[PDB]
Design a protein around this ligand. Structure first.
Ligand SMILES: N[C@@H]1[C@@H](O)[C@@H](O)[C@@H](CO)O[C@@H]1O
Length: 320
């Protein structure tokens, strides 16, 4: 049917390596081969790779941009040369793509927010306290939009103080250092919210080295990686708001025939791996937005949560 290239930004967590495996398999089910190129968090490498792939004229490119600004010209070059470009996970609103498959990021933030509020209230009686937020890389719209959705909720209660410190390049060691430094300066911190679970792995270790045990400082993160689900069962993590990795990948495969053949993608409500998903036509082109979900000890074992690594059995079917 055609070759698809995936320009993955890094392979430095379970969502990234997982996305490779999920895209390859689902694209295999609808008849496409896939090849993966890793930018390892270097914009230069990814732009070199775009051009390399442009020159290889595949049936489509799937991009998850290291930096959402820097790649805008690249995306345009591909489309100039009539190569379909699909944006995965990291939304690029500034220039048209042929398809976009993302989580509801602002909504994940909102969900994070609601729980931060119910937590704190649970601890402090009133909606008050202090939160440390550890967003991801500033070049990444996934964490940028989660930040908006989260702050929107918290700001509504000025009795909650927020301290936010980004983990540059999505690095857990940066998270680690932030948590130790912010904790020493603020022993009153009630909750840390980090925008992906591999960051919470560092937070836990930092909290441990300060003498803390599970539950002492509440913790939440927002991508659903396996390590997060581990930390939930261990009592370290109060909440993990997942993004639906498998659905986001499957959605790309479901629509690949429309994307490769340059056929239109119809707006509406779709089911993707059992998730109600919403396709709209945006200025950056067709866009499917798949909901995230709050996970706690109470539902951490649900097989629909990608962190349990139970991908749906059967197969994807191409949208007609
Ligand atoms: N949505 C993903 C998130 O799960 C995480 O893999 C991050 C890489 O650390 O990149 C993107 O933000």
């Amino acid at each position: 049917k055609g070759m698809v290239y995936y320009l993955v930004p890094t392979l430095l967590d379970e969502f990234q390596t997982g996305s490779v495996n999920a895209l390859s398999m689902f694209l295999g089910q609808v008849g496409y081969e896939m090849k993966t190129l890793n930018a390892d968090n270097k914009t230069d490498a990814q732009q070199s790779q775009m051009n390399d792939v442009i020159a290889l004229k595949p049936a489509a490119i799937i991009l998850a941009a290291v930096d959402f600004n820097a790649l805008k010209p690249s995306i345009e070059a591909a489309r100039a040369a009539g190569i379909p470009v699909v944006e995965f996970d990291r939304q690029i609103t500034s220039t048209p793509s042929d398809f976009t498959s993302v989580a509801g990021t602002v909504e994940i933030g909102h969900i994070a927010g609601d729980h931060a509020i119910s937590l704190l209230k649970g601890k402090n009686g009133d909606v008050k306290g202090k939160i440390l937020q550890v967003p991801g890389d500033p070049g990444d719209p996934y964490t940028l939009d989660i930040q908006k959705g989260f702050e929107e909720k918290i700001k509504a209660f000025p009795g909650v103080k927020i301290i936010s410190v980004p983990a540059v390049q999505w690095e857990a060691s940066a998270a680690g250092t932030i948590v130790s430094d912010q904790m020493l300066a603020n022993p009153d911190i009630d909750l840390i919210f980090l925008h992906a679970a591999h960051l919470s792995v560092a937070a836990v270790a930092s909290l441990e080295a300060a003498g803390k045990k599970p539950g002492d400082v509440m913790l939440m993160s927002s991508n659903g990686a396996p390590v997060g689900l581990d930390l939930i069962r261990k009592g370290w993590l109060n909440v993990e708001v997942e993004q639906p990795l498998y659905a986001q990948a499957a959605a790309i495969a479901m629509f690949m025939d429309k994307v490769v053949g340059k056929k239109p993608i119809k707006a509406g409500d779709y089911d993707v791996l059992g998730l109600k998903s919403v396709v709209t036509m945006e200025t950056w082109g067709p866009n499917i937005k798949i909901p995230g979900s709050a996970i706690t000890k109470e539902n951490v074992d649900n097989p629909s949560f990608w962190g349990n690594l139970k991908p749906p059995t059967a197969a994807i079917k191409s949208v007609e």
